[PDB]
Write a protein that binds this ligand. Sequence first.
Ligand SMILES: [Mg+2]
Ligand SMILES: [Mg+2]
Length: 86
Amino acid sequence: LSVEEKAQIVNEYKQAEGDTGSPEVQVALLSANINKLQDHFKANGKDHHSRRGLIRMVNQRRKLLDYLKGKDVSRYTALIGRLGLR
RNA sequence: AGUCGCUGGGUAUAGACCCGAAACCGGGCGAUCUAUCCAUGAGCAGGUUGAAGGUUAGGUAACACUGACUGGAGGACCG
Ligand SMILES: [Mg+2]
Ligand SMILES: [Mg+2]
């Protein structure tokens, strides 16, 4: 993922902060990066050592959602529907 | 003492006392039956079975894979 494509996302899903630590910043950065790789793995089929890196990012994303659900519900469904998951 | 007739018995060559093969060769006739092919036609009551596919619900990062609804394949099944 590029540098300005990171800066496009942090500007968008900022929690009126200027700050990159909140889960709505972190979940957004991972989800844009999984969608980019899906055509790398339709050309490269036998790329197994890079398949291993993608499953790290998927499992990291389901851990931050349950932390988000384990605190609030209003912040949760305002983020699930804004990305279209589950 | 031989020669040319005539009438008889033989012999040679021609179907050669009469009847009787299976086969072989040469010009034709035939695919209105039957054996394949070609062009143009039509014939097969009824009653079962239920493939692939598709839709949608779940499902998965995605493809997996599940269910339901449909669907109408076969040198398929009874008749
Ligand atoms: Mg004829
Ligand atoms: Mg004929």
